[PDB]
Ligand binder design. Structure first.
Ligand SMILES: O=C(Nc1ccc2c(c1)-c1ccccc1S2(=O)=O)N1CCC(F)(F)CC1
Ligand SMILES: O=C(Nc1ccc2c(c1)-c1ccccc1S2(=O)=O)N1CCC(F)(F)CC1
Lengths: 546, 546
């Protein structure tokens, strides 16, 4: 019958607890046992600490009142505090040391996923120290995972006053027997028990999680590692920039710090980076995930030459100019990866660092048209099928649900004949009309892509393939150059089109190239192996793009 | 008959020139005269430097070819280069030293304002050095002021080849006798002269500006300092965030670096910060200029309680959460300034620094309702007029052009009876039906505000005045606190409503408060004295908010 779980911050969701530092400070300074804890609670409901927790005063106003409390306590104990005693120094180190208790947060996320309402109820203060940003960052990371955050200093009440428990129940819209309450301080559990709530005293994490498992009937300990956190489209900041008359680019933006621009492939969306966007922002970066030209909310003009590399790269430079960005890190996948190599070759001043997932850097052959290279290979027969305007559009737009369900599949779930596409007369000729759902995607995720492609269709996206000769002529101007800015190439073991061996001569052009490799990964890298992608990108950004 | 002016970058728009460093390096190192200049030009059209300027190779590829050229030149001169000789060190220092030639840029801006087409035509390279950002920033600042930027390394041609001059004329759509060409290198003028263009050899800035004045008939030297650069609404990045169902906030965004949030007053728009937005972004900040709730493209719900301070401050915190910002600097004016003091009092962790233009911090009096304080003063009689829903709306919405033309005026151009507004029966009862245009604003600027207020009217904006009792009750909770984060108060000498003497007791609440004062400034601070505002804010941000 439980349907809500309430957690404390200090000592429960974040470790170590502040009170723990008071005891460790006493032992380190050879002070009488409990002395700093007595000064902290000095006065009870009338004391300085209660005024602080109720929001009457700020942390900087409380520090000298706590220092005065430490002297009154030392005088009655007949001891002398060291000459270098500082409450600010002690509290600063305690707050900095506090980190998220990962297994406790994972249990909260699992309960929320199974239908529970989750909340944080904490005794906290108005932090106005010069170092207050460290605390703001902690709260931001936690608050996105809970339904409610109730802070004592904002509501004017504190634990253990019985009215804060009534306020909590009114907010949750639940009766006490439907609520689990976790706290590390016994006195704070007593009022919740008097009301009828299930209480768990937190001394060590594992024992508290075992009690929680037993009482909710859900497995929380020994569970598989969850997928990274993903975006909700309606919670994102949406940005719109006009780069040319009748050409507007849409993007999604999150975080602060060095700008990182994400460039998707075919036939994708900004939504293909849903697992990377929160991870990269949390790592200290300002992420801009684009809808490339021809896709989603970006403009989709019908003319073929609007999609040649020269025009696309120039519009990306105009995008940085209108946003007031002198530089950005460029990360691309598939057609987006092809574009980011050309950005580094033609506009290195604007590119802080360049990374490509799956797409190798392949230099143009001045002795052979790209049409002849494509005809002398059976794996690229689909590129000839994509040439005639109207042909692939009619097949791909006929049933959008079938199109995305057939393309977005893991390497072992393939349902498409990759060869003799032209001979067969289409991409889906030997394919089922109702394909099964892949393990990589949910029905809700597929429907987001369906909704986006209902707006402009496949004309714009397919035109990226209809400029082979124009792109070849433009690329021939860079054959004498080398890429000498920080670069990363990530290969995917099981990509059918972009095999890892197609990247082996890149070191001749990018002599200081860094590499990444993902085993058991197909073409749709970001959604196939999201944890592995995040780890490779974050490590490279922190060392080579900082 | 002149209608286009073309400028070189090196030696003309940016000083000192690169060639100037080669000569100064020779003198400093006691090398033979002209040695480094001979190595630089070694090979002519077939030499390394021409390949660099045409985009065949990058700057890092050219450095060791230039080092080899310096050795071949030294061998034939029978001299030895010092043991610590480095082309990279020499070029790095030269590029860093180069700064915008302010009077040359001012002359370019004046000509553009008088109808001329302006362009930069330069011999430049693909910069891939680790320090390339310094150059990208320089180009970004310059490119926003010119119609065209033609770089040799992007077009594959160089000065003095005659085809680059033909390419320039085709781009400008003009005949040679309609073009003025400025360059510091004589050889680069010769082809432009052969075509019939007016040429100016730049040796010193003043003499070149005198020749330019004489030939265009426009005064360029000894002119009054121009106003700061202003935004074009259609060139801005527009951002939209949903903070609550049916409540979406619109903002304009520019720059990179620490986030700065601008909060306008009544009855204004994000457009009221048009002179501060480019200046703050250029100073190294990421500016977010809001349309506050009830205004422009932000949501404007009709309910009065949607505009009380508690709700407004909470939505501003949700805005930072959805954008992934742990902190922002908050700068407000008028009603926006009132809001930023309450953000610092209730959410100090989220506020890096706080600044208010005109609006002082006035603490609530727990012994008297704000309605009684307003009735015991004749200058605030307009606040009683704004109380009754529908009354001030009908008068202010009747003729939008008259409304904005009557309000947006300098201190000496006032046309409104400020007292006995209720007795008189309105704000505009003794006002002309067609008021003259103020010197602060253009007709085009007034029409932007007219267009914005056509969407939602005055209901939302007026509701900010209809929560006096609710705001008073909420503010009473902070009477024991002090503002101890970095703070700035800016007073305006001639503001009729917010007189500087209303701010005199702020030091009791904000003991380390910094101050600014603007003489001969009325209520509309940002557009009345924009240069003075920019200088006060930039100085304070760089010292107290960095
Ligand atoms: O065509 C691609 N990739 C690519 C992306 C998505 C799909 C295919 C190929 C493909 C091929 C055959 C059948 C179905 C499909 S699919 O619709 O699943 N590229 C060429 C240009 C590049 F090198 F820039 C990057 C890779
Ligand atoms: O009402 C204001 N300012 C303000 C802003 C704009 C105009 C007036 C007052 C006003 C007053 C009388 C006639 C015309 C006009 S007006 O439409 O030109 N404030 C009160 C709350 C505050 F203290 F937060 C900031 C200042």
């Amino acid at each position: 019958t439980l349907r809500a779980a309430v957690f404390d911050l200090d000592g429960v969701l974040a470790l170590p607890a502040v009170f723990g530092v008071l005891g460790r400070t006493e032992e380190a300074l050879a002070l009488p046992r409990g002395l700093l804890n007595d000064a902290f609670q000095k006065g009870g409901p009338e004391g300085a600490t209660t005024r602080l927790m109720k929001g009457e005063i700020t942390l900087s106003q409380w520090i000298p009142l706590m220092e005065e409390n430490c002297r009154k306590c030392s005088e009655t104990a007949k001891v002398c505090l060291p000459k270098n005693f500082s409450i600010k120094e002690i509290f600063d180190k305690a707050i900095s040391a506090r980190k998220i208790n990962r297994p406790m947060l994972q249990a909260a996320l699992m309960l929320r996923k199974k239908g529970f309402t989750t909340a944080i109820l904490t005794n906290t203060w108005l932090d106005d120290r010069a170092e207050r940003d460290g605390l703001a960052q902690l709260m931001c990371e936690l608050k996105m995972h809970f339904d409610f955050l109730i802070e004592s200093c904002q509501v004017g009440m504190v634990k253990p006053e019985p009215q804060i428990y009534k306020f909590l129940l009114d907010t949750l819209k639940a009766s006490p027997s439907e609520v689990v309450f976790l706290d590390d301080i016994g006195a704070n559990l007593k009022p919740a028990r008097d009301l009828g709530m299930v209480t768990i005293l937190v001394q060590d994490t594992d024992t508290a999680l075992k009690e929680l498992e037993k009482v909710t009937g859900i497995q929380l300990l020994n569970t598989p590692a969850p997928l990274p956190t993903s975006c909700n489209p309606s919670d994102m900041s949406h940005g719109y920039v006009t780069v040319k008359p009748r050409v507007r680019l849409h993007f999604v933006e999150l975080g602060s710090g060095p700008a990182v621009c994400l460039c998707h492939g075919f036939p994708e969306s900004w939504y293909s980076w849903r697992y990377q966007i929160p991870a990269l922002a949390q790592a200290g970066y300002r992420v801009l995930a684009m809808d490339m030209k021809g896709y989603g909310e970006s403009s989709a003009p019908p003319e073929i030459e609007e999609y040649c590399m020269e025009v696309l790269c120039k519009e990306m430079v105009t995008f940085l100019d209108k946003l007031g960005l002198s530089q950005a890190v460029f990360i691309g996948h598939d057609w987006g990866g092809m574009l980011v190599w050309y950005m580094a070759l033609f506009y290195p001043e604007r590119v802080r660092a360049v990374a490509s997932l799956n797409t190798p850097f392949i230099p143009a052959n001045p002795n052979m048209s790209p049409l002849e290279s494509i005809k002398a290979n059976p794996v690229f027969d689909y590129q000839l099928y994509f040439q005639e305007p109207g042909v692939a559009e009619a097949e791909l737009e006929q049933n959008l649900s079938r199109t995305f369900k057939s393309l977005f599949r893991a390497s072992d779930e393939s349902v498409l004949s990759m060869h003799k596409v032209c001979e067969a007369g289409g991409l889906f000729v030997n394919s089922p009309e109702e394909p099964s759902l892949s393990r990589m995607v949910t029905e809700e995720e597929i429907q987001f892509y369906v909704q986006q492609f209902k707006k402009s269709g496949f004309r714009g996206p397919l035109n990226w393939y209809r400029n082979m000769e124009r792109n070849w002529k433009w690329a021939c101007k860079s054959l004498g150059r080398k890429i000498l800015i920080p670069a990363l190439m990530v290969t995917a073991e099981k990509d059918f089109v972009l095999v890892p061996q197609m990247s082996q001569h890149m070191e001749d052009w990018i002599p200081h190239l860094k590499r990444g490799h993902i085993e058991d990964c197909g073409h749709w890298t970001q959604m196939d192996k999201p944890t592995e992608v995040n780890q490779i990108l974050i490590k490279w950004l922190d060392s080579d793009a900082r």
